[PDB]
Amino acid sequence: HITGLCGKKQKEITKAIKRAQILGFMPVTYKDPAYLKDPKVCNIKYRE
């Protein structure tokens, strides 16, 4: 409901996130600082 992807692409995104985390490509507990300023895909507005 946020990303807005098909089932396939969501599942691949997720399997991918996990696989990037345990092998050591990506941090688990936060977004990497470098990428905080990237383009914004999602529909979440945190700050109001």
Binding site: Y30, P33, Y46, R47
Partner: protein, 86 residues
């Protein structure tokens, strides 16, 4: 604990107002359903007791979305009526 500290769930005050900051924070942790999970992991819940909660929550969200939906779709006809006292 093995990740770099202070990068996780951090918000820094701007213009010295602490209260509003803590508010933004709690809004976040609530956005992700972290508060929920904390209050939930205070105690255990057996798996049965869990699937019950799941289904209930889902039915409730369906009814909600639907209700909100008929509400907002009907929002047009709530204006002052044309034909009154025919």
């Amino acid at each position: 604990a093995n990740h770099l500290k202070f990068i996780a769930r951090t918000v820094m005050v701007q213009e010295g107002n602490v209260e509003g900051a803590y508010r933004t924070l709690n809004r976040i942790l609530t956005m992700d359903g972290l508060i929920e999970d904390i209050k939930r992991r205070r105690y255990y819940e057996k798996p049965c007791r869990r699937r019950q909660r799941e289904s209930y929550e889902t039915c409730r969200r369906i009814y909600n979305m639907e209700m909100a939906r008929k509400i907002n779709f009907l929002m047009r006809k709530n204006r002052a009526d044309p034909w009154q006292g025919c």
